[PDB]
Amino acid sequence: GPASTSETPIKKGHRREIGLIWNGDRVFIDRWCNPMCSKVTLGTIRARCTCGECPRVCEQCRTDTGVDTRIWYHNLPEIPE
C-alpha cells in the first residue's frame, strides 16, 4: 500500500547538486551532476561513476566539449582540464 518501506535500488541518472561557496559577503551556488550514483555531498564534488553508463549526457554535459570524450569510467586519473 501507501504507508510502507519504499526501497531504493539502482536508479542512475542526472541529479543537480549544490556546492555553496563562502566568498565575501555573498555565496555562490555551483551546478553539476553527481550525477546520482555518487552520494551527493553538501559542497562542490565530482564523483566518477563506476557503472560506465552515466552520466552519458544531459543539458550540461551535452553542451560540454569534453563530453565527446566523456569518461563514464572511474579509471581516469584526475581532471587537469
* Residues of the shown chain interacting with Zn ion in the complex, contacts defined by CB under 5 A: 12, 14, 33, 37, 49, 51, 54-55, 58, 60-61
CA–CA distance, 60 with 78 (Å, rounded to integer): 20
Distance in Å, CB of 61 to Zn ion, minimum = 4
4 vs 75, which CB is nearer to Zn ion?
75
Strand partners, 26: 23
Distance in Å, CB of 36 to Zn ion, minimum = 7
**Residue 51, C-beta contacts closer than 8 angstroms, at least 6 positions apart:** 10, 12, 37, 72
Q: Which residue type occupies 45?
A: I
26 vs 56, which CB is nearer to Zn ion?
56
Distance in Å, CB of 42 to Zn ion, minimum = 19
